[PDB]
Enzyme design. Structure first.
Site, PDB file in Angstrom:
ATOM      1  CG  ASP A 102      49.702  69.033  37.656  1.00 18.84           C
ATOM      2  OD1 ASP A 102      49.598  69.238  36.116  1.00 18.84           O
ATOM      3  OD2 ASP A 102      48.284  68.624  37.348  1.00 18.84           O
ATOM      4  CG  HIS A 133      47.735  64.214  36.415  1.00 17.23           C
ATOM      5  ND1 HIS A 133      47.924  65.213  36.665  1.00 17.23           N
ATOM      6  CD2 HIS A 133      47.807  63.030  36.912  1.00 17.23           C
ATOM      7  CE1 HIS A 133      48.224  64.920  37.761  1.00 17.23           C
ATOM      8  NE2 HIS A 133      48.297  63.376  37.887  1.00 17.23           N
ATOM      9  CE1 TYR A 184      46.141  68.588  41.018  1.00 16.04           C
ATOM     10  CE2 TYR A 184      44.824  69.034  41.705  1.00 16.04           C
ATOM     11  CZ  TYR A 184      45.925  68.407  40.892  1.00 16.04           C
ATOM     12  OH  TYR A 184      44.864  67.886  39.440  1.00 16.04           O
ATOM     13  CG  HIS A 234      41.894  63.865  33.856  1.00 15.08           C
ATOM     14  ND1 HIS A 234      42.612  63.120  32.645  1.00 15.08           N
ATOM     15  CD2 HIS A 234      42.633  64.913  34.500  1.00 15.08           C
ATOM     16  CE1 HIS A 234      43.902  63.336  33.696  1.00 15.08           C
ATOM     17  NE2 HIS A 234      43.807  64.527  33.862  1.00 15.08           N
ATOM     18  N   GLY A 252      39.514  61.920  37.634  1.00 18.92           N
ATOM     19  CA  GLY A 252      40.618  63.675  37.555  1.00 18.92           C
ATOM     20  C   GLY A 252      39.701  64.088  38.460  1.00 18.92           C
ATOM     21  CG  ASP A 268      47.815  69.225  33.465  1.00 24.99           C
ATOM     22  OD1 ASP A 268      48.502  67.863  34.994  1.00 24.99           O
ATOM     23  OD2 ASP A 268      47.277  69.743  34.315  1.00 24.99           O
ATOM     24  CG  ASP A 283      39.839  59.299  42.925  1.00 26.97           C
ATOM     25  OD1 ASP A 283      40.541  59.665  43.443  1.00 26.97           O
ATOM     26  OD2 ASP A 283      40.424  58.889  42.272  1.00 26.97           O
TER      27      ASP A 283
HETATM   28  K   LIG Z   1      49.795  65.916  30.092  1.00 26.57           K
HETATM   29 ZN   LIG Z   2      47.346  67.217  36.313  1.00 24.97          ZN
END
Ligand SMILES: [K+]
Ligand SMILES: [Zn+2]
Ligand SMILES: [Cl-]
Ligand SMILES: [K+]
Length: 408
Positions: free
Chosen positions: A276, A181, A320, A141, A149, A179, A99
């Protein structure tokens, strides 16, 4: 004053990655096409005086082997030089693979974001700017000795470190990760510190990256980890189920941001604003938008933070659907100006004429093409209040205790 980070080398480097390609260009050219650049103050990316001074800046968080491996990996990718078995094991051991693969400029592209945010952080320290923006930053990340990430060097960590290591009584920073994530890297970077409070509002479900920021694991039942040592109770997380829209997201985090501001009273606020969570992102997990009078969830959170009148660093991140990330962050910038300089900027619903105008097709409008529709969140609010209580007690903090509860 609102600062924003750009520059020809900066623009070249933030657009040289394989995953995000030219996203940074579409973002800045659309901020330019809406005549927002003149109202913004250009904060230039940081630059060091020796290689030694660069390493000491970056190894403030990362280890030297990881930084060395990352520079070597850029070297090897430049030349057609093949990777020996021993080079394969070295890279794997820092997870620079799969990744997070290397490319000709992976180290210069990672370092650019560390320069942008450090510059944006010093800009806030000397009061040159009330708020700084860096849409080529926000890689939460990246960890001390490992990539994750498509985040190689954690600029957010370095920029927070600079903020807390600056005389105000005692500097304290509130980190807010919007985010999709989980902000795992920023969260274990200060896991042990009570002077940097990290709060992330993400999606979690089995197998979903990064898979942290929610109940874990034996000890019979599972517990919800929120920091350790003298930083116990300092890391906050709100995992949400898929398909949430602006309204619920806003009601989800609204009360949590006010509480955190009241109880902590941060010297600086760092906001990761990954795009995202938009309904139109390929992930297709959240259903947020960039609408502004059904107000957008992002803008709602950004307004709420700006109202605190604390020096704030606003960073980009994931996202993205490049034109739709541009749509979102152009709005975020307009808001920031309106909310800081007091100048209201009106943005035509039609995308202005410019370089990347064809990308915003086929409707060429500023609002993303999504019509919104559509309680465990109560459980989280309660758990988060208690944690917040446990945090203020631990750090001998005084607060209303009643007004904070009324917020819900
Ligand atoms: K977050
Ligand atoms: Zn993200
Ligand atoms: Cl506006
Ligand atoms: K922490």
């Amino acid at each position: 004053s609102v600062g924003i980070v750009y520059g020809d080398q900066y623009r070249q480097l933030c657009c040289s990655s394989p995953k995000f390609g030219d996203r940074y260009a579409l973002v800045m050219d659309l901020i330019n096409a809406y005549k927002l650049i003149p109202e913004l103050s250009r904060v230039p990316p940081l630059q060091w005086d020796s290689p030694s001074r660069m390493y000491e800046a970056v190894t403030a968080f990362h280890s030297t082997e990881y930084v060395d491996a990352l520079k070597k990996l850029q070297m090897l990718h430049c030349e057609e030089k093949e990777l020996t078995a021993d080079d394969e094991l070295l890279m794997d051991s820092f997870s620079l693979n799969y990744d997070c693969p290397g490319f000709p400029s992976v180290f210069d592209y990672s370092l650019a974001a560390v320069q942008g945010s450090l510059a944006a952080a010093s800009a806030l320290i000397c009061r040159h700017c009330e708020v700084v923006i860096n849409w080529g930053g926000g890689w939460h990340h990246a960890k001390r000795s490992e990539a994750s990430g498509f985040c190689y060097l954690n600029d957010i960590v370095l920029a927070i470190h600079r903020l807390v290591s600056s005389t105000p009584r005692q500097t304290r920073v509130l980190y807010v990760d919007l985010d999709l994530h989980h902000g795992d890297g920023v969260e274990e970077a200060f896991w042990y510190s009570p002077r940097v409070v990290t709060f992330s509002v993400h999606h979690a479900s089995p197998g979903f990256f990064p898979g942290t920021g929610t109940w874990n694991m034996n000890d019979k039942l599972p517990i919800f980890l929120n920091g350790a040592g003298r930083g116990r109770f300092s890391a906050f997380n709100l995992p949400l189920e898929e398909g949430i829209n602006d309204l619920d997201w806003s009601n989800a985090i609204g009360p949590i941001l006010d509480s955190l501001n009241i109880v902590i009273q941060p010297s600086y606020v760092v906001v990761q604003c990954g795009a995202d969570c938009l309904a139109t992102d390929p992930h297709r997990i959240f259903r947020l938008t960039n609408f502004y009078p059904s107000l957008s969830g992002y803008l709602y959170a950004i307004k709420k933070i700006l109202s605190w009148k604390v020096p704030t660093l606003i960073l980009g991140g994931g996202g993205y659907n490049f034109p739709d990330t541009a749509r979102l962050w152009t709005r975020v910038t307009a808001l920031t100006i309106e909310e800081v300089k007091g100048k209201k900027m009106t943005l035509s619903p039609e995308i202005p004429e410019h370089s990347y105008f064809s990308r915003y097709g086929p409707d060429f409008e500023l609002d993303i093409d999504y019509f919104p529709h559509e309680d465990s969140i109560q459980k989280h609010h309660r758990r988060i209040l208690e944690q917040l209580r446990n945090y203020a007690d631990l750090n001998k903090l005084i607060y209303d205790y009643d007004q904070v509860y009324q917020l819900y």
